[PDB]
User: Which sequence fits this backbone?
């Protein structure tokens, strides 16, 4: 067994981390004080959940997590909320003065003063690992901490652990729920610094999670709590193969093998189905076919785009609940004829499939209902370039006038980094268009 | 359309189905860049102090 | 980023300042004696941003009160909440400032400024993490205008990496103490465009019209004007004094409002509009609040938004209401009048909601606009300036204190450059 | 009150559409780069579908179906008809055609040409991208192209009288956001002025019926019908008087079959039924009726220009059907093709 360290950066990172770990605990039977009656082997184990938990002499299970925010409010909620005892205080790191939505304040100004402390705590966590796999890193694109300090951290992790895979969970900015006008700046900036340091990032446009929570959870104005519960449903679908018995995606290296042939194009599209209101009085349970079919409906994607006008490079289907290979192959056969699924010529048309018999776990008092079967499709499709297009466009709109640039220079950056990141994004957009369009 | 590498366990199954075959910087470098931004930032602060001195 | 240090300077400065401390003391459940007597714990969760906790578990405003004559400070101290303030923070001269910028910035005020800074320091050193400072003053007098800009300059020197925020009252002929106010205002605008992160332009002409045309007050007092200003100050600082999802601070506000560093002069707005006398009992619908808060007749800087374009907007709703209906109405405002928002700053209107309504209202909306229309204000002043200066009229009052006409040429020229910039982005792309 | 921008200033149809929108007093027009619009009348190339339908509190519509080029470029149309199963290889209404790249299907085009020359039946072809060259010899074509398309020439077309002249049929079809297929009732018929000559293939004007080409190299142009165009009333009345049949029976049934088949074939690829932005589009289908009264499909144009008489009526029909459907305000001219 090999271990995975989670790192949550900035407000969105820390909150989504909360949600995920709460979910992990419910799924694994781990109580809020760290006691897992399921675990007969006390003080240690060579089990699959040990990928994400370490065991104490007192039989306590503690996440391989680090929360880091340059500002104390959200990690103080963690330090006082329901899952106090779960975490070692040395793992919850705060500053006193945030990065004021300013990438340059997080990367240079405030980052330089806290990166060494963050890396020492991360190494004190790696030091309880027989064979560390790598890192899951949760952050936002739009935040000052979430972009600046995250990319500095990714740099340093590459240089200290050059042989460990690194996975990102990025929160793409959406105007309905975004805080700041310079989120398109930070986004581009941090992507340019992190592209060569990340092995597979899973973008999540807030806009999508928002419309899903409106249409399907029947929530009027969704909050961060709703978004984060749904996002953790997805994250757990994507990380279950690490914490459970199985032969698909059983280590971080398999993710870049099954989903990333070209290393620059490492942003897979996650599509999750079915999302059903816990308040639905009467609900008819969807078949394998109905949820596999829903996987190809853009209204169910973490990023609104149209895969019909891109080409696919790799597809993986992750089922939780009552599913059997027969019905998956049947559904696929039907869907290939009913849908438009074009692969790149240099890649076989087909699906790597994973079934876990344990149906989705839902938070008591959440908004999602229990279902008999659910699925998450990870697909590396070029159509995701749309989300960069939009982003790049907004970027240009401001930079054309050098608007807000002085806030970044004030912290020590150089206009050159703006242009150089933008050019990198231009390369990335063009690469997507090479691989995909005709 | 054929299955490949079916693996079964108590927790679930996993397999592949195929339909059609086909046709870094150092520590000193990042330390140097952080310190270059801190220098530019110090220079700006000094200019501000000079203008306020005047 | 918790503690803010408040400073009020001069007559007008201390009079709006004292009203603001009343309004928010009432909002936090502090009585004039200094003791909390409210109900919700929401009234203490961010009490530190403006109040030190003192002996006896009382609360003392983190406010320094500055004048060059004792008059207005004596009357503040004998006022309603006068006993709230720390007596050490009452820093006054005796000679006054004669509505003379030069007296305040160069001569009489220079005797006093080091004392004021000593108290500032004693107040900062008692802070956990100081966000920055905020000043309420006028630009037409002498203590407020001249010494406020002096203080701003020295505070920037002592704390160069902190936010400097002002509530600045622009002078109008419709409400005028002396003929030399355009000189003091032009000198102060020079300083402010140099040394302030965020300035709330509060035009006295606008408050006069609002009291007269709107509130139907046939002969408005300075108190009728200060009521508006204290209500608006309370409304802008709501996101700071109360628990929110945003966790907003001064620095983020400056980062997101100020696309270019000299263009940090904001139009405030209130809605609904309320007089001391009439206490109207009709709750407003959310569409009503939004139509009103974006109405020019609800803006405290006597500019016409339609004569320009909005660089950035920040809106603050207060009270129990539908956030869905809010977002709806706010998007409705943006899309029905898109020509008036700049296309090169995507999604440049941002909104905050607080669940607590202010005293007397159940629904409140407060508006913070960085519009290019503000150039109008600065042109207005500049015209009034030149009508005198082309004849060096009243300049002896300033030359007698050592100032040279070159300083006036420079200050005017800096303000005309400010006007140029605003105009430039008013027609960009 | 709805907002719309206009990102193609050279479009006759949507020019009259802008005009009629503004005249309702319920549409305002914005600058092109303003994202806060309801309706985009977008450009013909590199249209930014990646940016549509991401503006909260705005229902967005656009006048082009993303993916429709695969029916409206000549090479991609040919390849779609060949490969797509619903449009069988034996598709009886598409002239047998092959794609060629300059120095592929070169090999199979030659194989078919030779299989034909054994029977020695008419083997004229046409090369297509005004750049188009008809010939009976493979080598002249291949030296002219050195991406083009080589299509069997319909050697025996229906010839109008008096005059003895060929023609093509343009139909206009409106596909709205719900993927209803509306055929405009007033199709147009673009004729040759100077008579069809079987052997004189080098006079461009006898065989090519492009109105462009007619207003220039035509000896007389506008003799029989004004502007070289015959509308459906005259075409029907002539067909009744001369061949004892109807336009609707001998021609329009097949036209509706072809339109319905092409559009329902590409439907799953381009339908915006569940997307975050909607599309409508106006296509122009170019048909050719051989002397047996059989209809053939030549091309589909995605940006098409109407005829000067029908502009007002068709553009009012577009605003009614494709636009007022999404954005309501305060005997139809279209035939619904049922699928
Ligand atoms: N889905 C989701 N998005 C969030 C959440 N919290 C913040 N965001 C998004 O993140 C962006 C701002 O990022 P933050 O995480 O608040 O920024 P930060 O990392 O705290 O950086 P600072 O500016 O220094 O506080 C906005 O676009 C928000 O939409 C969350 O809990 N869930
Ligand atoms: N295989 C064929 N058989 C008979 N006639 C043909 C033919 N190919 C072309 N033609 C004639 O020549 C003309 C062909 O031009 P075509 O329509 O292919 O170019 P075009 O200019 O219309 C491109 P577009 O689709 O934009 O209209 C038609 O008007 C038709 O009369
Ligand atoms: N809004 C408002 N303006 C005032 C008040 N008192 C004075 N002013 C304005 O301030 C200017 C004179 O400033 P003043 O405060 O007396 O200057 P000082 O010498 O700095 O105290 C004039 O434009 C007055 O209109 C007040 O209570 N409210
Ligand atoms: C265009 C844009 C984008 C982002 C922001 S925000 O990040 O500054 N949030 C925010 C802050 C405030 C205040 C801070 C301190 C105050 C007192 N003094 S009010 C008020 C409203 C809002 C919405 C603002 C404007
Ligand atoms: Ca164990
Ligand atoms: Mg934060
Ligand atoms: Mg006075
Ligand atoms: Mg044509």
Assistant:
């Amino acid at each position: 067994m090999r271990e995975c360290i989670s790192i949550h950066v900035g407000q969105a990172g820390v909150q989504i981390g909360n949600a995920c770990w709460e979910l992990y605990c419910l799924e694994h039977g781990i109580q809020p004080d760290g006691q897992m009656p399921s675990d007969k082997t006390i003080g240690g184990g060579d089990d699959s959940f040990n990928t994400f938990f370490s065991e104490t002499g007192a039989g306590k299970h503690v996440p391989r997590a680090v929360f880091v925010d340059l500002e104390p409010t959200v990690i103080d909620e963690v330090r006082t909320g329901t899952y106090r005892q779960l975490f070692h205080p040395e793992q919850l790191i705060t500053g006193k003065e945030d990065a004021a939505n300013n990438y340059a304040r997080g990367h240079y100004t405030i980052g330089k003063e806290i990166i060494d402390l963050v890396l020492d705590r991360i190494r004190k966590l790696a030091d309880q690992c027989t064979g560390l796999q790598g890192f899951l890193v949760f952050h936002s694109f739009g935040g000052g901490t979430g972009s600046g300090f995250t990319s500095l951290l990714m740099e340093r992790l590459s240089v200290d652990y050059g042989k460990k895979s690194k996975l990102e969970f990025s929160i793409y900015p959406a105007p309905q729920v975004s805080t700041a006008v310079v989120e398109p700046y930070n986004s581009i900036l941090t992507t340019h610094t992190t592209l060569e340091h990340s092995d597979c990032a899973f973008m999540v446009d807030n806009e999508a999670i928002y419309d899903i929570c409106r249409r399907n959870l029947d929530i009027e104005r969704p909050t961060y709590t709703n978004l984060n519960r749904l996002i953790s449903q997805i994250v757990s679908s994507i990380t279950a193969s690490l914490r459970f018995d199985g032969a698909l995606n059983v280590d971080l290296t398999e993710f870049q093998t099954n989903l990333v042939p070209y290393p620059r194009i490492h942003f897979p599209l996650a599509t999750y189905a079915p999302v059903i209101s816990a308040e639905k009085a009467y609900h008819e349970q969807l078949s394998v076919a109905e949820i596999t079919n829903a996987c190809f409906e853009p209204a169910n994607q973490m990023v609104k785009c149209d895969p019909r006008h891109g080409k696919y490079m790799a597809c993986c289907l992750l089922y939780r609940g009552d599913v059997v290979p027969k019905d998956v192959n049947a559904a696929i056969a039907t869907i290939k004829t009913k849908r438009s699924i074009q692969f790149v010529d240099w890649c076989p048309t087909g699906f790597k499939v994973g079934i876990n018999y344990q149906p989705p776990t839902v938070v008591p008092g959440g908004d999602l209902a229990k279902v008999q079967r659910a699925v998450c499709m990870l697909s590396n499709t070029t159509a995701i370039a749309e989300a960069w297009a939009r982003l790049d466009h907004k970027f240009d709109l401001m930079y054309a006038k050098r608007a807000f640039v002085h806030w970044y220079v004030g912290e020590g950056m150089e206009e050159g980094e703006f242009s150089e990141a933008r050019e990198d994004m231009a390369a990335l957009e063009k690469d997507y268009e090479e691989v995909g369009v005709d | 359309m054929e299955v490949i590498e079916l693996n079964k366990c108590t927790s679930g199954q996993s397999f592949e189905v195929i339909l059609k075959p086909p046709s870094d910087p150092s520590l000193e470098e990042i330390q140097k860049k952080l310190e270059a931004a801190e220098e530019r930032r110090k220079y700006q602060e000094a200019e501000l102090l000079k203008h306020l001195a005047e | 980023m918790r503690e803010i240090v408040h400073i009020q300077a001069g007559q007008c400065g201390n009079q709006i300042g004292a009203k603001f401390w009343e309004v928010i003391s009432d909002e936090h459940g502090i009585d004039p004696t200094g003791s909390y007597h409210g109900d919700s714990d929401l009234q203490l969760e961010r009490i530190n941003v403006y109040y030190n906790e003192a002996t006896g578990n009382k609360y003392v405003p983190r406010a320094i009160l500055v004048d060059l004559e004792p008059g207005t400070m004596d009357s503040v101290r004998s006022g309603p909440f006068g006993q709230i303030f720390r007596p050490d923070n009452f820093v006054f001269g005796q000679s006054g400032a004669g509505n003379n910028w030069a007296k305040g910035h160069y001569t009489e005020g220079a005797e006093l400024v080091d004392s004021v800074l000593d108290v500032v320091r004693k107040e900062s050193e008692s802070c956990d993490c100081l966000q920055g400072f905020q000043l309420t003053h006028s630009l037409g007098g002498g203590t407020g205008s001249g010494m406020g800009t002096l203080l701003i300059s020295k505070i920037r020197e002592e704390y160069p990496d902190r936010i400097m925020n002002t509530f600045s009252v622009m002078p109008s002929p419709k409400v005028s103490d002396t003929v030399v106010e355009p000189y003091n205002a032009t000198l102060s605008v020079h300083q402010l465009v140099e040394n302030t992160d965020e300035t709330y332009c509060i035009d006295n002409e606008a408050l006069y019209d609002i009291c007269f045309r709107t509130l139907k007050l046939t002969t408005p007092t300075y108190g009728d004007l200060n009521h508006l200003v204290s209500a608006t100050m309370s409304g802008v600082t709501t996101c700071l004094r109360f628990p929110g999802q945003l966790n907003a601070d001064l620095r983020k506000l400056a980062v997101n409002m100020v696309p270019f560093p000299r263009l940090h002069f904001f139009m405030p707005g209130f809605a609904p509009l309320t007089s001391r006398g009439s206490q109207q009992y009709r709750a407003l619908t959310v569409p009503e609040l939004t139509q009103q808060m974006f109405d020019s007749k609800n803006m405290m800087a006597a500019c016409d938004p339609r004569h320009g374009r909005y660089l950035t907007v920040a809106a603050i709703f207060r009270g129990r209401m539908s956030m869905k209906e809010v977002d709806e109405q706010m998007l409705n405002v943006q899309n029905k009048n898109s020509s008036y928002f700049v296309e090169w700053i995507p999604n440049n209107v941002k909104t905050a909601v607080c669940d607590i309504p202010p005293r007397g209202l159940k629904m409140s909306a407060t508006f913070i606009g960085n519009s290019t229309a503000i150039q109008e204000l600065f042109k207005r002043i500049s015209e009034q300036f030149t009508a005198m200066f082309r004849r060096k009229a009243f300049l002896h009052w300033y030359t007698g204190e050592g100032m040279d006409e070159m300083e006036f040429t420079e200050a005017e020229s800096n303000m005309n450059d400010l006007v140029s910039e605003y105009q430039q982005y008013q027609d960009a792309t | 009150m709805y907002t719309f921008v206009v990102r193609d200033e050279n479009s006759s149809v949507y020019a009259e559409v802008s005009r009629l929108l503004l005249a309702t007093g319920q549409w305002k027009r914005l600058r092109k780069d303003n994202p806060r619009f309801n309706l985009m009348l977008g450009e013909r190339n590199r249209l930014p579908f990646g940016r549509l339908g991401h503006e909260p509190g705005l229902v967005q519509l656009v006048n082009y179906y993303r993916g429709a080029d695969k029916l409206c470029r000549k090479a991609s149309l040919v390849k779609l008809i060949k490969t797509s199963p619903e449009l069988s290889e034996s598709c009886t209404w598409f002239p047998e055609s092959y794609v060629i790249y300059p120095t592929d299907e070169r090999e199979v085009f030659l194989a078919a040409y030779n299989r034909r020359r054994e029977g020695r039946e008419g083997n004229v072809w046409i090369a297509k991208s005004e750049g188009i060259l008809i010939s009976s010899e493979a080598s002249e074509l291949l030296d002219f192209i050195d991406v083009h398309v080589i299509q069997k020439y319909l050697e025996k077309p229906l010839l109008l009288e008096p005059g003895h002249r060929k023609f093509d049929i343009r139909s206009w079809v409106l596909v709205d956001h719900l993927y209803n297929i509306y055929l405009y009732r007033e199709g147009v018929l673009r004729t040759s002025s100077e008579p069809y000559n079987s052997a004189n293939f080098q006079d461009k004007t006898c065989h090519l019926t492009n109105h462009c080409i007619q207003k220039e190299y035509s000896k007389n142009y506008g003799r029989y019908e004004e502007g070289n165009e015959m509308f459906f009333e005259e075409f029907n009345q002539y067909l009744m008087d001369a061949l004892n049949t109807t336009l609707e029976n001998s021609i329009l049934l097949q036209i509706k079959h072809i339109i319905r088949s092409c559009l329902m074939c590409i439907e799953p690829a381009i339908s915006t039924k569940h997307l975050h932005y909607q599309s409508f589009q106006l296509f122009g289908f170019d048909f050719m009726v051989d002397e047996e009264l059989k209809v053939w499909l030549i091309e589909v144009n995605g940006a098409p220009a109407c005829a000067q008489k029908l502009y007002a009526e068709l553009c009012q029909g577009i605003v009614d059907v494709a636009i007022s459907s999404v954005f309501p305000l305060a005997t139809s001219i279209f035939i619904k093709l049922h699928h």
